Structures are given as C-alpha cells and as structure tokens.
Amino acid sequence: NAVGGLATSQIRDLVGNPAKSGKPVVKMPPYLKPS
C-alpha cells in the first residue's frame, strides 16, 4: 500500500479529488413547470 514510505493512495483521496463547483441552480417559476 505504501509506495516508498508514502500512503500515496490515501494522500490522493485527500488531495487528488477536489470538489467541482457547477452552474448555479435557477429557481423555476411555478408557471413554467409544465414541460
């Protein structure tokens, strides 16, 4: 598991996967609900 003394996988899971911020959600007026 440790590659040269480093738990790289663990580090990856803590460093290599930042969260991605997507488009803001638009609140739908009730009269636009019908498809």
Partner: protein, 47 residues
C-alpha cells in the same frame, strides 16, 4: 385576326406552361433546405 389570335394563344400558353413546370420544380427543390430544418435548445439548470 381570329385564327392568328387563336394560334398565338395556344403557343403562348404552351411556353408559359413549360416555364411554370420547370420553375415550380426548382422552387420546391430550393425550399427543401428550409422545410427540413431542425432546432435544439440547450436546457437551463432549473431546480
């Protein structure tokens, strides 16, 4: 001018008919670009 008039009428109508047929085909051919258009809209990110 009775006979000359009748004959000229026949010939003029025949030639105009040929022109009408050809131009009608060409018009319907050109309109095929617009009569088959398609639209698509990228949806918004609603709740």
């Amino acid at each position: 001018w009775w006979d000359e008039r009748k004959l000229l009428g026949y010939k003029t109508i025949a030639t105009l008919a040929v022109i009408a047929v050809s131009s009608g085909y060409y018009n319907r051919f050109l309109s095929g670009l617009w009569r088959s258009r398609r639209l698509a809209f990228r949806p918004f990110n609603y709740s």
